[PDB]
Amino acid sequence: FSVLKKLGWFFKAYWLRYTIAIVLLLAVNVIEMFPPKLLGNAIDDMKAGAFTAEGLLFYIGIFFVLTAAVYIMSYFWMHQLFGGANLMEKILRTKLMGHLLTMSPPFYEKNRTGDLMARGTNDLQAVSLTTGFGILTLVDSTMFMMTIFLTMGFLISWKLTFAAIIPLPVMAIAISLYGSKIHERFTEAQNAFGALNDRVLESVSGVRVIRAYVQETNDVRRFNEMTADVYQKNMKVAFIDSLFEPTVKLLVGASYLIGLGYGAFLVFRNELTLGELVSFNVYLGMMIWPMFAIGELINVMQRGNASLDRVNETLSYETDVTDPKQPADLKEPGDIVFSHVSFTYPSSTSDNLQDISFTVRKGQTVGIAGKTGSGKTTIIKQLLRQYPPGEGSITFSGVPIQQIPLDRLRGWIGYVPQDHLLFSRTVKENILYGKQDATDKEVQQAIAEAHFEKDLHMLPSGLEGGQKQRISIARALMANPEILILDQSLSAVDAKTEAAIIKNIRENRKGKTTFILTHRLSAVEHADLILVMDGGVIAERGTHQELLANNGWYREQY
Amino acid sequence: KIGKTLWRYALLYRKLLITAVLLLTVAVGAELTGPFIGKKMIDDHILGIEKTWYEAAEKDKNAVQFHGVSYVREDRLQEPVSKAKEAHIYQVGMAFYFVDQAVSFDGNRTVSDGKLTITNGDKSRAYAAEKLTKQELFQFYQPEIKGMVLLIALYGGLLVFSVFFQYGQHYLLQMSANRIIQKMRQDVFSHIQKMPIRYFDNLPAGKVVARITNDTEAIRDLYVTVLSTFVTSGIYMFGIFTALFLLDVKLAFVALAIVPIIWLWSVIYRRYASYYNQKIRSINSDINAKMNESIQGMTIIQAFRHQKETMREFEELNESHFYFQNRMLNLNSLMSHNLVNVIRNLAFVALIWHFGGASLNAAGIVSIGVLYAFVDYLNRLFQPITGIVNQFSKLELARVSAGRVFELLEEKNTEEAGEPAKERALGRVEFRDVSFAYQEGEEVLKHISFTAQKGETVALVGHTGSGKSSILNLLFRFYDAQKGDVLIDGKSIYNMSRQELRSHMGIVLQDPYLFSGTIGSNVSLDDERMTEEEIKNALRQVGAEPLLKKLPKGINEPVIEKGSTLSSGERQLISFARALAFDPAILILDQATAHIDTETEAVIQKALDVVKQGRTTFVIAHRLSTIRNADQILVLDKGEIVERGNHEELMALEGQYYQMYELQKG
Ligand SMILES: Nc1ncnc2c1ncn2[C@@H]1O[C@H](COP(=O)(O)OP(=O)(O)OP(=O)(O)O)[C@@H](O)[C@H]1O
Ligand SMILES: Nc1ncnc2c1ncn2[C@@H]1O[C@H](COP(=O)(O)OP(=O)(O)OP(=O)(O)O)[C@@H](O)[C@H]1O
């Protein structure tokens, strides 16, 4: 029972509502303790000589009053407790999503998406159920069973009570054991059903081969056998599931007949009366429940602790990979330089970069060439602060990137990843995405200067090969980045569109730095600085002219 | 229609249903007789003391010696003394007062000077009366002790008896449900094997799996709910109502007046809960989708500083979901159990009104036994309400899933044919100006007419979206040509069973499918008809692949992960190995590999060379380099075979092959 200790903040923040809820619960229990006694007294008074219409009216009135009170108070304390649980869900969802936003790629490399989605869909339900319903069942199983027991003991008798409550403990124990075993069998059956569901996908995705080789009969046999296995598992579950109603009926009937028989025996010995007997019966009838409440409490508490101790890990323990510091006083980036940068990915022992050194002036265009896997895009990652700084120095006009605010740095750069990351919004929002929805006019320009408004005319605005790339580059150009980075931006279109595209971008962006990563070396001709990256180093560097006066390097096309 | 089909599938296995219903009926009968035992125990023995007493002799003939005079109750009387000697035993307050005289009236009682006056508001005859201490009462109660014991035994007996039948019925019913579902499942799968290929092409593979499995599970839950909850509750309530009517008809009708309460309650709760639950589920689906699409591809979220807006949208979703959760909570807090407790206390009030009204009349008898019976019956009757309402609200999802599965089952346009092939194809194949249109009014192949000789390697090379793969579909009869005609060894394709045709041919596709399991079964497609001919993998190559670990003739199982660990080249390799193992007459190669690698394709070329031998092979590829040796190339444009001939003949005019071979290099 440590979940309540680990959620102190929630109760301290919301303590008044829970105080009202618990006080109302106790008051409702006490007030609800009467009606059985009132009926016992009314019965005991009908037999006796004295009974008048005044007693009838009084009993009717008190019954109605108590009924109204319990109705209203029950409504209000359920309101408070289950509203508290809902607020807990809301708070946890906000916390989880915010933390997910504020993390970096390395965190997502260690943690799979399935676990995060589970922790955003399952653990939250368990923790909210713990804060609301586990507390409800704790109140019941602790106080309700004690008050009913001490009311029966003192109002009616103690011999009858001790004798008629013997079977209920064993009933609860048996219920708990049945619950555990049936949960185990249910897990087994669910695993079998999943194994079935895997097979159907294979037999339906690969329909062409099966029919082509007339193997459908074997697929029928396999499916029928696995269905039979699922049926056997379900029957093994039902074997244990059919033991709830017999045990409960037997062990409640035992208690009721002990009450009736031994109470009639005491009525003979004159220690009891008829009214007390019926009141005892009703008290047992309402006492049946705490038995189930105990098991509900234990299960919910264990589940909640398991979920919470896990959520705190992927919500708190992780620290942001990159950290800013005292902001520096810089407004725009002068020049980008690399002073022997050395860097290694967290999840690998390979360098991927070995003291890369070069420089870039304002308005300088830099071209990068090489073969696949030769750390072409790793350098850009070293500039977008997506990973730890590693080693070296990357100074923007004289200050390392460490001092530039993360907010400021992202403002300068314009990223176009080689992969297609287009969000499932309308095309308009996807392109305004960079500008954060400031205005509409320059969208038509942005796409015209991207020379892809023709594609827009050839598609209805909404939903959503080279279309993704053109949209991405237009989005990057929306922000007018001071350092525009393209990572194989135009691969689908070669030598016909990309040439004019790069020419227009270059002429438009005149005093702004530009980086071009591209497999084709034809598209980086005008780049006044070109580097070739092989392995973790740069084999050669120089202007396009020098390239022609060097080793033939993948120029074997034209 | 959903109800009809559900009833039809339930009629199968009617023996189990009948047996379960009988067992449930007996169990409920005993469980509800129990309270009659209790009521008789109370009334006929406790309150029988208040019944008249008559003086008699002392030969222990059911008589009790008060002081020196023995009396016997009227019920245990043999008419020895009936009229002259009439005794009574009243009780006022906590005291019991013996009257040794006959009486006429009965009403309120008091004692002032030992003369127990019974006023009754008409007139008061005072009779001298005594008190019975605490032991004398016992002597009037002593005889009944034996009767009660017997009654008690009955209770216990019946109790344990009843137990067995409950376990009998809940089990059978479950089995019934499960069994029905199993049958249903089989049927659907059978129908899946008889649907045309179109059905799968025009619908994602994910949805059919769901329709086959998840909807069957939903129908299983529907059956379990219906039987176990509704039938059991109906029988239980009918039994309780029978007991109540047997006890007292007047209050039986009042207790019968509750049924409209349940009806109205269920109607309203469904009306509101359906709406709120639908909103909650839709919003949760949106929240999960947003979280997924953000967690994936968050790099641009962080790069373009869009965190605030995404958080804004997420919190809008969260606010709406929280609001509807609270509304559902309000609905519950106003109906779930508070209404039950209100009705229960109102029933207590009604019992008090009815019985106390009779008591004041001075003519009716309280009959505390009937009160005990009714309180017990009403406690048992008010129990199943919450379930009934909840599953009544929930039935709709299962009704829609059943509708879906049945509309799947009731499809009419299906394929019916099957038989093993009876003769060896010989590989003669011809086309007759066929023309096929996928959907309608749009022709993908027009006037395709050609003949393929027993010489293999008859490739079809064209351009993207030119209509090459459609030839495979028409050749395997996955689609009907709708025009022209196709001949196999002079026999019409459209005059013979589909399975027979597919028995003559083989296929290799772009994405070689690696079925979960061992290699040996995968190579044989778990046919079980073939001996250890999987050794045919050797013909492809060994590559130490069997030597890496275990063996692939049912001894190694590396395919449990869809074959991702195995190389793509090895995937095509096992594909060719299977194709050769089945040893067809016509081989069709649908290869569109995006990268030769010039390292991993040597094995594919070798396998193609070794398998194409002694067959009639169609190579559906656009590389034009592995097809240099083709006996006859075919090039089609927009679905028409523009040109035909050999590579040398097709190089007499340079054209298309020239552009490709020249511009492709480097
Ligand atoms: N996510 C990663 N984690 C660890 N190491 C990586 C990762 N991505 C690439 N590497 C390593 O870095 C080198 C490849 O870097 P990168 O992929 O940026 O260059 P590239 O593939 O040439 O670029 P492009 O993908 O545009 O062709 C290889 O040595 C590879 O092992
Ligand atoms: N099941 C189908 N339903 C509708 N249209 C289809 C279907 N299969 C193919 N098509 C379309 O019919 C035409 C036939 O093209 P086909 O599939 O033969 O391409 P292809 O030339 O083989 O090229 P590739 O091998 O790259 O797919 C195309 O427009 C194609 O998209």
Answer with the one of A303, A328, A353 that is the final residue of a domain.
A328
Say yes or no: A94 and A193 in one domain. yes
Listed by number, the residues of chain B in 313-332 with a beta carbon closer than 8 Å to a beta carbon of chain A are 314-315, 318-319, 322, 325-326, 329-330, 332
Say yes or no: A5 and A123 in one domain. yes
Q: Which of A47, A235, A484, A522 to mutate to test the interface with B (most CBs of B within 10 A)?
A: A47
DSSP codes, B286-349: HHHHHHHHHHTT-HHHHHTT-HHHHHHHHHHHHHHHHHHHHHHHHHHHTTSSHHHHHHHHHHHH
Any A CB within 8 A of B95 CB: no
Domain carrying residue A170: 1-328
Half-sphere exposure of A127 (CA within 13 A, CB side): 28
Is-contact A400 A341, C-beta < 8 A? no
> Quick one: tokens of B198?
């179109």
Q: Which of A29, A66, A131, A209 to mutate to test the interface with B (most CBs of B within 10 A)?
A: A209
Half-sphere exposure of A329 (CA within 13 A, CB side): 0
> CA-based angle B10:B12:B17, to the nearest 5?
65
Cα–Cα distance between A100 and B374 in angstroms, integer?
60
Cα–Cα distance between A296 and A357 in angstroms, integer?
65
Give chain A positions within 8 Å (CB) of B297: 421, 423
Residues in a beta bridge with B118: B109, B125
Answer with the one of A328, A362, A386 that is the final residue of a domain.
A328
Any A CB within 8 A of B186 CB: yes
Give chain A positions within 8 Å (CB) of B329: 78-79, 82-83, 86
Q: Flag if B295 and A71 touch (Cβ within 8 Å).
A: no
Instruction: Return the amino acid letter for B376.
Output: D
Beta carbon pairs, A and B, within 8 Å = 324
Compute the nearest-CA separation of B632 from chain A (Å). Answer: 25
Cα–Cα distance between B547 and B536 in angstroms, integer?
15
Listed by number, the residues of chain B in 158-177 with a beta carbon closer than 8 Å to a beta carbon of chain A are 159-160, 162-164, 166-167, 170-171, 174-175
- Identify the CA nearest to A302 among candidates A144, A143, A180, A181: A180
Is-contact A557 A551, C-beta < 8 A? no
Closest-lying ligand to the alpha carbon of A488? 1
- CA of residue B466 to ligand 2 center, whole Å: 8
SS3 for A340-387 is EEECCCCCCCCCCCCCEEEEECCCCEEEEEECCCCCCCHHHHCCCCCC
- Identify the CA nearest to A390 among candidates A353, A358, A415: A353
Q: How was this structure determined?
A: cryo-EM
Cα–Cα distance between B24 and B167 in angstroms, integer?
9
Q: Flag if B326 and A105 touch (Cβ within 8 Å).
A: no
Task: State whether the Cα torsion B377-B383-B388-B393 is positive or negative.
Answer: positive
Q: Report how far apart the first and last C-alpha atoms of chain B are (Å, whole number).
A: 65
- Identify the CA nearest to B383 among candidates B341, B436, B333: B341
Q: Which of B23, B134, B212, B300 to mutate to test the interface with A (most CBs of A within 10 A)?
A: B300
Among B199, B202, B470, B478, the mutation site with the greatest number of ligand 2 atoms within 8 A of its Cβ is B470
Listed by number, the residues of chain B in 49-88 with a beta carbon closer than 8 Å to a beta carbon of chain A are none
Answer with the one of A328, A356, A379 that is the final residue of a domain.
A328
Closest partner residue to A218 (CB to CB) among B355, B507, B527 is B527
- What SS3 class is residue A151? helix
Closest-lying ligand to the alpha carbon of B635? 2
Say yes or no: A220 and A343 in one domain. no
Is-contact B604 B576, C-beta < 8 A? yes
Q: How far apart, in Å, are the Cα atoms of A333 and each of A326, A395, A484, A516, B445?
A: 18, 10, 12, 18, 60
Breaks following residues of chain A (C-to-N distance > 2.5 Å): 464
* Ligand 1, residues at Cβ distance < 6 Å: A 345, 347-348, 350, 352, 370, 372-378, 418, 487-488, 517
Numbered residues of the known binding site of B for ATP: 462-469
Our answer on whether the CB atom of B639 is closer than 6 Å to any ligand 2 atom is no
Is-contact B216 B181, C-beta < 8 A? yes
- CA of residue A491 to ligand 1 center, whole Å: 18
Is-contact A341 A382, C-beta < 8 A? yes
DSSP tag of A555: -
Is-contact A537 A531, C-beta < 8 A? no
- Identify the CA nearest to B540 among candidates B591, B586, B577: B577
> Quick one: tokens of B265?
């309650």
Relative to beta strand A529-534, strand A537-542 is antiparallel
- CA of residue B468 to ligand 2 center, whole Å: 7
Say yes or no: A398 and A298 in one domain. no
CATH of the domain at B502: 3.40.50.300
Give chain B positions within 8 Å (CB) of A51: 108, 356, 359-360
The single residue listed with the structure tokens 């009705």 is B343
Neighbouring residues of B410: CB distance < 8 A, sequence distance ≥ 6: none
Neighbouring residues of B343: CB distance < 8 A, sequence distance ≥ 6: B258, B261, B382
Residues in a beta bridge with A360: A336
CB-CB neighbours of A544 under 10 Å: 15
Atom number of ligand 2 nearest to Cα B439: 4
- CA of residue B56 to ligand 2 center, whole Å: 111
Counting every residue, how long is chain B?
666
CB-CB neighbours of B11 under 10 Å: 10
The single residue listed with the structure tokens 């009988």 is B22
Is-contact A486 A473, C-beta < 8 A? yes
Compute the nearest-CA separation of B546 from chain A (Å). Answer: 24
Neighbouring residues of A429: CB distance < 8 A, sequence distance ≥ 6: A423, A437
Cα–Cα distance between B396 and A397 in angstroms, integer?
67
Residues in a beta bridge with B72: B54
Our answer on whether the CB atom of B469 is closer than 6 Å to any ligand 2 atom is yes
The resolution, in Å, is 3.3
CB-CB neighbours of A401 under 10 Å: 19
- CA of residue A378 to ligand 1 center, whole Å: 6
Closest-lying ligand to the alpha carbon of A208? 2
Residue having the nearest C-alpha atom to atom 28 of ligand 2 = B465
Order the strands of the A483-487 sheet from edge to edge: A413-416, A483-487, A513-517, A365-370, A529-534, A537-542
Cα–Cα distance between A102 and B91 in angstroms, integer?
82
Cα–Cα distance between B654 and B636 in angstroms, integer?
16
Q: What are phi and psi of B309, to 5 degrees?
A: -70, -40
Atom number of ligand 2 nearest to Cα B198: 1
Any A CB within 8 A of B221 CB: no
Q: Flag if B333 and A82 touch (Cβ within 8 Å).
A: yes
> Quick one: tokens of B172?
């059978």
Say yes or no: A360 and A263 in one domain. no
- What SS3 class is residue A5? helix
Give burial (CB, 10 Å; 0-12/13-18/19+) of B413: exposed
Domain carrying residue B523: 429-663
Cα–Cα distance between A333 and A322 in angstroms, integer?
20
Q: How many domains does chain A have?
A: 2
Among A374, A378, A381, A524, the mutation site with the greatest number of ligand 1 atoms within 8 A of its Cβ is A378
Say yes or no: A346 and A394 in one domain. yes
Give burial (CB, 10 Å; 0-12/13-18/19+) of B127: middle
Say yes or no: A291 and A414 in one domain. no
Atom number of ligand 1 nearest to Cα A488: 26
Instruction: Return the amino acid letter for B502.
Output: R
> Quick one: tokens of B423?
């003769």
Q: Flag if B200 and A433 touch (Cβ within 8 Å).
A: no
Our answer on whether the CB atom of B468 is closer than 6 Å to any ligand 2 atom is yes
Is-contact A383 A394, C-beta < 8 A? yes
Q: Flag if A417 and B300 touch (Cβ within 8 Å).
A: yes
Give chain A positions within 8 Å (CB) of B509: 208-209
Our answer on whether the CB atom of B391 is closer than 6 Å to any ligand 2 atom is no
Any A CB within 8 A of B479 CB: no
- What SS3 class is residue A514? strand
Say yes or no: A434 and A509 in one domain. yes
> Quick one: tokens of B65?
């010696």
Closest partner residue to B345 (CB to CB) among A63, A270, A556 is A63
Q: How far apart, in Å, are the Cα atoms of B249 and each of A43, A557, B244, B246, B254?
A: 21, 103, 7, 7, 9
Is-contact B322 A86, C-beta < 8 A? yes
Order the strands of the B586-590 sheet from edge to edge: B505-508, B586-590, B616-620
Q: Which segments of A102-129 does DSSP mark as H helices, in order?
A: 105-110, 113-121, 123-129
Say yes or no: A358 and A307 in one domain. no
